[PDB]
Design a protein around this nucleic acid. Sequence first.
RNA 1: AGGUCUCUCUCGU
Length: 462
Amino acid sequence: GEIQWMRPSKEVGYPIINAPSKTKLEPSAFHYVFEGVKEPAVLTKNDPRLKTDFEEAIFSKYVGNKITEVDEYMKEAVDHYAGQLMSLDINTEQMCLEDAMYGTDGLEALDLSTSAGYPYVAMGKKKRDILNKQTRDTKEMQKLLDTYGINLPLVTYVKDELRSKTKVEQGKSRLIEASSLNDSVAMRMAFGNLYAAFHKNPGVITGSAVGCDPDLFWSKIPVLMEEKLFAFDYTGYDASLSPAWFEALKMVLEKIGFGDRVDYIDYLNHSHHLYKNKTYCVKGGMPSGMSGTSIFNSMINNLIIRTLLLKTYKGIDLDHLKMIAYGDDVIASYPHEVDASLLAQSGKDYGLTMTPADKSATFETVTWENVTFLKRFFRADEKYPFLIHPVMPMKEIHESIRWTKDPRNTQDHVRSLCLLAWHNGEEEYNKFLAKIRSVPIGRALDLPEYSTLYRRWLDSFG
RNA sequence: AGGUCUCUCUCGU
C-alpha cells in the first residue's frame, strides 16, 4: 500500500471535513479499582502525549506495494480456494436493491447510526433522511445513485479507542475510511449474495469466522482441524496489501461466478480520500470501512497462507489444510508442523511482514494451550472436555472497565464484561465481581452469577 | 467519527 499524491482539497474544490478532536473516552467509576496501562488513541497534532509529527505518523501505515503480478504460486492458490467456495454453490445474482438497503436473511440492514459519507455529509444529510425502515422505500435512494454514481471518495477518520502508551506517544492511531452511502449499497447489490453465504457458513470451507458465536463455536473448531497447528501475526496487513492480491481476489471472484462485478475491487485497490483539509489517492491496501472488508480481507488471507505454504512446502496437499480467518486474524492446521518462522520470510517479499503470534520474540510452536483467535484462548471444561471455553484474559477486561463513553451504559458495559469474564472460571470470576462490588456504584449493578452463566452455557448446546 | 460479525439489555405485535 502506497499513497500517490496529496493536496489541499480546495485545490480541487473539495470541502473541508469536520473530524472531531476530543475523545469521548472518559475514566469511569472503576478507573482506580482495576489496573490498566491503556489510553485513548491520539486524535490531533497538538497532543501533549505526542512524541513525533502526527500526520507523518498516521499515514506511515502505507509502506509501499511489492509484487504486482500474480506469480505462479498465487495462481494455483486461487484455484484451490475458488474450488472450495464452489462447494458452497453461491447465488451469483445481483442482490435486490431493497434487500441491499434494509437487509434479508444472512445480511443485516445498513447502519442508520452511522454516517453516509461523501457527499451526503458535506450537506449534513444523514442515512436516516434517505432510508425508512417500515416503508422500506427504494425510490429516493435510487435517484441518488443516478445522481452521484459509484466509486466515490472515502472520508478518512482517526479511530477513537484505547491503545498502548507507546502507540499513543509514538503516534500510531488507527484510521477509518468512511464509505459513501452510494458504494455501500452498490457493493451490496453485487456481493450481498456472497456476503450472506459466508455469514451463513463460518468454518473451513469458506475459511472465514465471520458469523460464528465464539461461545458455541469454540467447541466445534478443534473438530474441524488437523493435528499440528500454526499461526502468526501481521503488521499492518490492510494498509500493506498489494495490487497483485486484488487481481488474485478478482480471479477467485471470476472463478465462482462474479466476473462482471470485479470492477469494484479496483475502486478498493485504487481509492481517493478526504482527510480534513487534504485529498489524496492510494494504490493498494484495503480501505477498512468499505463494504465487504471483513469478507475480502478474509478471502485474501486464505490466498496468502495457501500461497506461502507452496513457496516453501513444494509438494504440500492443500486439500488437508484447514484454516479459519477473520481479516488478518487466523487459526490453521496441517498434519505436519508448517514452521511459521520461515513463512514470515516468504512474506516480506510479498509486501507482508509477519511476526510471531502474540508479541513473542521467538516463533514459539503452536498448541491448544497458547493459541489465540479473536483474542480468546481455548480451555476445555473441567466437567465436559468436549466443551471448550473461549477465554478472554482478565487483563483485557480490566482495560475496558477503566473507561466509558457515557456512564448511562455503566450497567450494560459491566454486564457485558461478565459475559466475557466468567470463562476464566469461578474463582477468577467471583474475584471480579468482588472488585466491582468494592465500590458503591458496583453494588448497584445487577450482575449474573457463575452458576447462572454456566447453566446457560450448557443449556445452549442443548 | 466507517464496514461487519457475536452476544446482551430496553420497548413493541
